[PDB]
Assembly symmetry: C3
Homo-oligomer: 255 residues x 3
């Protein structure tokens, strides 16, 4: 069962297609605009698609020709340019874009970004909020915002240092130049590199099947702890409280 | 001179066995339960052993057949299951386990974890609190708690991202699958990989000898600064204050 | 046009030597004391040189025979020893040294550290505050302060974990032993290793030319965001505000 939006496609595959029960799905969100570009429709539709994921155990995010060329400068310029030099108006504009990056990062389930070819700018900021990142050999990653006189402000400068370190983030962000798949894996931006797009998509599906087999609330608590940004003792105490609420005798016995 | 507990063995080797002076030791704590498992005795005895380290300059933590299989599900179930769904009671239970992980992390001297074979779950959380980690070629590391419906709550989700990055921690914690020694070294979880268990233990002893030769309070201040979790300026100011109190003319001249 | 100080040399190269306009420069600061050592003159002169950089688009920091042997123990002892055991007096002494490390870290433009040969102690702490680090094959990096009974307190223990991770910083800081160029690159301390000193200096110049071609305020905002140490949402909101103030139609069109 698929839902076509203007800028994206969302498909959900029932994990059991037999049985008389309502269970979970694996969701796949495809960036479907030209070169996976992000225009004004994207900022409106992506959060709508996220609201459809109440039943989903895992979300895969992927592209078509490439993953994403990032922000479409031309089509977003209509909203951005009139707000330049107006901090409150400018914030309001970027708030719509944060609905995507912060919305994805806040999803309670595992999110797998499966990247082939170009992953540029807002594309890279988006995957920075995913839980697991996989790519193909041909994948190339960059944050070229500086070349346009832009400071990356969709969460890349905050999230990327947790993944690859501050120095390596500074390399990407200050030079604006791309890194290849082998480098991304060395740096910890991705945890697997596959031969090609088809191998990538197959592996993402398999990884999703693996995660969907695991207890949903343990995955959620783990994600919460890693993303909480709380001091050690507070983050620790919150994980303990999560287990108090969500551990079951049954999950112990089954595992 | 050795102390036998039920779950662990603690041995301390005087650094000078000649001389009429009371100096320092190298302490070795061996996880001595079956497969280095951690049951109710472990949580009681491990902090007791730590209280014996007033004279020790370095602590080595190691296993026997393997490093540690982690929590013994069966023997801890007696305490855990009755506390499920009761946040204050559950906290009290896990507090006893934190006495080990937080206790180890708080030790004023260098702690070397020397890992061979399996290092699983609470085993991995424990070494995350050590200062230096060494392993053999055959070592395998995992955080499989998710498979039991558990969110790792002994400090692994807080400590591991400082060592290997958030993305790599998410890989371990969400998939629950193991990584090998070569991967651990690439990721920064360990800083040396040795051919085998005997080579590992010998190297740990040698590294301990090296550290024990260094000024104790400089090692302590360094550990304090790295672990303080304070904002930059506060952490910096505290290191300066530590030097004001602990630097000596003699240590400058000797070095 | 060069400025000779006692401990350093500062040269600034106009980016356009044609034209009737006052533009930007590439600045090169050379550690010019014996083995790039840092004595009392260094702490006074280095901040003076930084005050000369109002027109500079990029700063390169480099050495001569080596990058830096770090603190000259003998010549700083006159100020340090009388302040031992006196927290307020000791702070005052180290404040003069922080004027260098914190001053460099606060510079609004990109700072490139170009390291050949030894980079030791305060030398390593200094480059930890740079934006990009390049080295030659022969470069060796260490934090041997522990051997002198010193806890590194010029920002290395705070900055290095952001670059290479806490475990790897603990290796350097606790053992006091050096790492080579290949290891530094693997660890993320540097992002390029060049064959030799001449190749290093040439590449640093080229990288500076590349960065100087980019919009100055986007580079500044990027540096601010990466270094702010603020919680996620605050750091994010501050980047958005920076763009509101500094993005231009012209920079979009040009890029």
């Amino acid at each position: 069962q698929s839902m076509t939006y203007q800028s994206i496609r969302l498909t959900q595959r029932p994990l059991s297609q037999d049985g008389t029960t309502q269970g979970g799905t694996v969701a796949t969100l495809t960036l479907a605009a030209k070169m996976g570009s992000m225009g004004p429709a994207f900022w409106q539709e992506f959060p709508q698609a996220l609201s459809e994921l109440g039943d989903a155990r895992v979300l895969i995010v992927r592209g078509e020709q490439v993953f994403s060329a990032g922000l479409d400068v031309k089509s977003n310029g209509a909203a951005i340019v009139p707000a330049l030099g107006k901090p409150d108006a400018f914030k309001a504009v970027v708030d719509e874009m944060h609905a995507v990056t912060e919305g994805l990062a806040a999803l309670p389930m595992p999110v797998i970004a499966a990247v082939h070819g170009w992953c540029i700018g807002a594309g890279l900021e988006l995957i920075a909020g995913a839980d697991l990142r996989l790519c193909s050999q041909d994948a190339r990653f960059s944050l070229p915002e500086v070349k346009l006189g832009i400071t990356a402000d969709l969460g890349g400068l905050q999230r990327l240092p947790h993944l690859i370190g501050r120095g390596r983030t500074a390399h990407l962000a200050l030079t604006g130049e791309a890194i290849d798949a082998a480098t991304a894996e060395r740096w910890g931006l991705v945890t697997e590199v596959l031969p090609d797009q088809d191998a990538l998509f197959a592996r993402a599906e398999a990884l999703a099947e693996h995660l969907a087999a695991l207890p949903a609330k343990a995955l959620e608590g783990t994600k919460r702890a890693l993303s909480d940004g709380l001091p050690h003792a507070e983050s620790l105490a919150a994980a303990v409280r999560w287990n108090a609420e969500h551990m079951t005798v049954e999950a112990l016995q089954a595992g």
